[PDB]
């Protein structure tokens, strides 16, 4: 008899790919919460007079600040097991910015041969990153019976930046959720005294990389728990293969139908018709669904890599799982359109979206003109129109009424400075928002309003 | 003759249940304002270097901070009647974390037998909450003629957390609004030095429970004022019983009508008539009324409990009063529809809401796909997409233009770190907002626009 | 011949009343900017460790803070001509909280006879404001040859509050805009150490009243400049009288028309005219004009009072000018409707506003139900639903997407504390905003959309 | 044969003028980022106890603060090469506020002859800016073998303000992007201790001008890189001239058509052609193109001046480039209307915009009435309605739900102070937003909704 829709096991991916995403995501989130709080700790340890909030605003301006910051950072490394809580340990380094038997490396980056003097110009600056590094590594015990890191000179005129390199091995003690011996961590701190500007302002930033592995243990019943999350991706590879195999057969019927439309008896209408509706001939939504497959499966293999080998980078695969989850979950709509009544409500979008897109091109075209205009006029005077990304962000957030009073307040502060710019910004912001709220959005509403009107008749 | 609508004494609940809610709410609000300001006081007393604002950001990072915080907390307990204003007194405790004759109890929670060491792994951690508590309680007078709380070691490597337990009895002197002798209070402070992460960051949080009772007094004319607010709930129980009794009789006529629709002469068309009409044949107004009722009456009994006995917990009953007040106040609309003209304006909603809900399922379906996608990609790099509750909160607040520039500003800060994530977030946020403002909301408007168009014809 | 519209001199009020408002407003604004910056100065002078921002958060918690705050305030009064800039002088007081020959008066407000003790209750508190005031006033010169304000005890158990009363005479040196000798000022500072709670938190607030007058000067050409702003209100009284006289004659024709419907020949159609339509035939535009008028004229007389003697109440008159300016400026629309095309665009509002108001009653009715519900549930746990004004403010601002993420962030902070309240607030906020954005606003749009549709046919 | 649209080389300006804008903008932005960070540096150097954030809130209140601020500023100038990083040098001044051989000039501005005293009025203030300046300039080397800037008296009663004038020459070391010897800079700092109020609050503000030039160097291959960006404006002048020449010939045909419409045979219908339609005949596209043109060309000449000449001021030319880029980019729409389908979507705007503008006049008219009303009532009590620019900003940002809860929170703070003002502001804000969201915006939507309805029929 009539067997049911065995092809509709795409519902399995609605859970499986989402659970693959949430299993990964809940573990990966939990790692970051540990990762960042450590970087918060290192800022409280290694930065001289750091505060919870000032990151971009935290910086050196005098020379004694820069010295005392560096020495404060170093002396806080030297006494890490003494004063700092959490229990870290020194790397004992064998890498590039550390010598064969060194741990903390404060490293200048300054010009090779050069000179700077206004009103008496005689110099020959030859741009170069001549890095001088001072090594230091203290032992754990008190000093046994058997130097110049303090005797250190920056050359501030000549100084690009100062980088304090070190790594801290550590044991993530949120492992007791697994209930056995822990998984092992290694932070890679970089205290950067950045002076690329030479403007008398030196951002102090402490930033870390994380490297994770499993360190020696002979105990029992930890190794089995890892395999359950490892095995679940094979369900994803099993579903993905089935989905990838299933759309292509539907495409085969596409290619068959291509023939059969003319093919029962050829010359339906002479020759060579381009059949623009036929150019949307295959029901491609399932190919779009299967392509979201390819990003899921390409995601999982790359996630299995990052898990199963020393590969440590969560960017592309993290996008590919999310994009695929999103692009599967948007696909639940075209699963939902097998219902009759719901299909009318979604068909309104699929009859309007050409018109809405065809209008949106015009709005984007104006919006860009505004993004350019405000950028060069309000880039000098105001923070929130500095770069074209930030102008577009601030404007595109300003269309919905976010930080509008906060922008308009920045204008008044520059009313004493160039009233033409203030009055220009008043006229500019008003003309931007009034157009985009009462004429654009209104028309975006009008197109779909008219679509919903036209579709039922 | 024709007696009036005596069944329309539901108007009584519009005041009575609202007044029950406001009488309770104004007294309960007034208690919290006292409750919290005391917790603000205890943070200024018992926390070493606490500031008005930093609660989540307030934490220890070095070991001398943790010591000095604990000792500062203890020495501020020891000298509470000395230095602190407001007039408290010590509990003189006979509970669980205090011994038979103790007051302040600083209490470690640390591992039983265990060890931690990177690059030389030999340990056997056996997860346990071996709590060591140090008791202390000072007398009021100066020391008469007839120890090691300072001689205290944390074991930071081993430390889960440190909890300082105490209670403070106190007299709420906002009782003079009643005009007689006061009602009596007891706070239950818990200073938590939480280190479940072992990330070198230890949140310091001081949190209190409140226990209220009436302490000895022989004076006159306080006991009568309490009874007036006690008696008013009996009006609620009186109205509620009448409302619960009145709906069920209307439902009886429902059950009778079931028979009588076919029952004047059976087989109108066999048994053909879709009992969907039966689903709309009983008036659901009365079910809305009873849903209000049961929450009001369940509210009141639980409110009478919290008032009349040692029960001190304002959660469920506080929801049940509010839900019932809300669900009565939404019911004023279907009281309001006995008017003819108003009924057309509300009938637009009751003809559209099926379509609006049937569309909303599709929007929620996409929105979830976005909630997943942004969560794993923007969970590591950004604060505002950390967990799926916060992603949904931030997105669902971001659809209306709240903190959009503040999210887009968090993106730029992570533009140096993984440009693919920045450019992904730019494309992600834009695609989220542009869809949800110009195509979704517009269609939500279109459905009701078309409903209002269709209803009058 | 046909004389023009001499009755249309209402255009004169569009300038005159606006100029009366701006002349007043620019002078009154300029006074406040001086008034407040002085209160900022006094906070930096007289408050111990005050910061630019903390006003509500600025408070005492220990007893030594309260002492040192008061003594710091007093010693900053004692040395005002020494250390403070701006040039003030002492009042030399002859008022109520100062003795006949005193200046600074620190004044307790504490209970008469009473006692407070938990767990050993024996007291007889007799609510009273027994105020003890300590007087002090230093001379300008160094001490010539010819006490216990430091020897002062608060009784903290007994203490309601401590108020430091003083006044500072001063010369507003922004008078040189007038170009002659200055107008003279007197501030009235009140440092309040408020402890009505007895919760160990004592808000420290410094607040001032301003009293202005003209102090001795024999010079020439200052007195003429005041008369020009004085005379301009007589133009307002001249226009107002003409407008008030003009409407009433139009109302006379109203009263005549009331008669004359039946009055050409009685029994026109029996009693078939309902007369309520006649109540909505007559033009309220002149009543709108008179409502503007009476507020303008009542404004001016009260402004002429404050100017021409005794000087110290704005509030009501300041509302009456603004309300009248607003209510005149809204009247420019019904001046604007003498045009034909514009009248169609405003007639859409005057055919829809009954329906919009008739719907709005239902929305407000739900909105109130939400305002009650959220108040008692989210009053304890959250700051932004504390009182029904603030609930309504936060909700009614939350309908447009203001501080929504900031409310939703307050929820997560109370997720550990009573998950039912968190999950309730999640469901509550969502249900509030989703209803009010996609179903309410959409219908508000639908009514006017349909009005604009229906009006042209 | 038929040659193509050679007149459509306006597409060249879409890139050329945009690239002219971005080339300029990316270089000009990069200069400001250097310019401002230096002003951040000078605030950290020359201001006593300055913080990252407090600019408007940063100010002096006592006299010892003002002294120590000035002396701190001076002693930080005196030791600039000692302590400050970034490498500056002293001007060695020959300008107006410096003597022939001076560098740092602290300069009072105080009254000539005058006196101030309340309650004993005898004075003759004669408004004058009698400036006393104290000169100082230290040498680079230690003091060789071969005064009263500390022995300095302000006269605070008499003091308008104190200005510390100096300039710092500096070498912008972000020149290595060009890869050769740097371009040379000169900052012009002004530390202003502003006391125009005499309210005991003295804003301390440090502000700089920038003067750039090229200082001596004999090296090779820097001079060629400048010429490439110089030459690219000649492409703008080349395109602009062609565009300006092309429109005017199209206008000639305009003037010719005027004649030719009646002119094949005049008296087409008696007197009629009526001519008013001819008054509304002429095609604006080319005027929009020329309005872009003139601003581009006027921009470029002034940009060539500003860079290559006595380089002075980035205001007008910066507006003219942006306005021209914007006004060209809006012109891409009327290039886009040569398509048939797109023209219907833009024609909706060009049939509605008269009606939308004709309505907007009424909304603006009410909005102004609100802007006046709120200004005088909420100017004293609240920060966000201080001046009519800020009232309009706050209201016009408040229509979209920006800082609404933040305004409504400012109301509650003034609920104790004049409840009539609080309750007035509650009623005011509600009446403002409820009108402007549900009746105005809704009608703005309705007009375009109806336009889109009417256009297709």
From Swiss-Prot, chains A, B, C, D:
It catalyses: Ca(2+)(in) = Ca(2+)(out); Fe(2+)(in) = Fe(2+)(out); Mg(2+)(in) = Mg(2+)(out); K(+)(in) = K(+)(out). One of its GO terms (molecular function) is NAADP-sensitive calcium-release channel activity. Changing residue 334 to C: In ML4; impairs Fe(2+) permeability. GO terms for cellular component: cell projection; endosome membrane; Golgi apparatus; intracellular membrane-bounded organelle; late endosome; late endosome membrane; lysosomal membrane; lysosome. GO terms for biological process: adaptive immune response; autophagosome maturation; calcium ion export; calcium ion transmembrane transport; cellular response to calcium ion; cellular response to pH; iron ion transmembrane transport; monoatomic cation transport. It comes from the Eukaryota. The keyword DNA damage does not apply. Glycans are attached at residue 161. Residues 48-62 are annotated as: Extracellular/lumenal pore loop. Changing residue 262 to L: In a breast cancer sample; somatic mutation. Residues 28-229, 303-313, 380-387, 409-422 are extracellular. Keywords: Adaptive immunity, Calcium, Calcium transport, Cell membrane, Cell projection, Corneal dystrophy, Cytoplasmic vesicle, Disease variant, Disulfide bond, Endosome, Glycoprotein, Immunity, Ion channel, Ion transport, Lipid-binding, Lipoprotein, Lysosome, Membrane, Mucolipidosis, Palmitate, Phosphoprotein, Transmembrane, Transmembrane helix, Transport. Changing residue 55 to Q: Modulates inhibition by Ca(2+) at different pH levels but does not abolish channel inward rectification. Palmitoylated; involved in association with membranes. Widely expressed in adult and fetal tissues. The most N-terminal extracellular/lumenal domain (referred to as I-II linker or polycystin-mucolipin domain) contributes to a structure with a four-fold rotational symmetry in a tetrameric assembly; the structure contains a central highly electronegative pore with a 14 A diameter. The pore is critical for Ca(2+) and pH regulation. The protruding structure formed by the I-II linkers may contain all the interaction sites with lipids and proteins in the endolysosomal lumen. Homotetramer. Homooligomer. Can heterooligomerize with MCOLN2 or MCOLN3; heteromeric assemblies have different channel properties as compared to the respective homooligomers and may be tissue-specific. Interacts with PDCD6. Interacts with TMEM163. Interacts with LAPTM4B. Belongs to the transient receptor (TC 1.A.4) family. Polycystin subfamily. MCOLN1 sub-subfamily. Nonselective cation channel probably playing a role in the regulation of membrane trafficking events and of metal homeostasis. Acts as a Ca(2+)-permeable cation channel with inwardly rectifying activity. Proposed to play a major role in Ca(2+) release from late endosome and lysosome vesicles to the cytoplasm, which is important for many lysosome-dependent cellular events, including the fusion and trafficking of these organelles, exocytosis and autophagy. Required for efficient uptake of large particles in macrophages in which Ca(2+) release from the lysosomes triggers lysosomal exocytosis. This is Mucolipin-1. It comes from Homo sapiens (Human). The lineage of its organism: Eukaryota, Metazoa, Chordata, Craniata, Vertebrata.
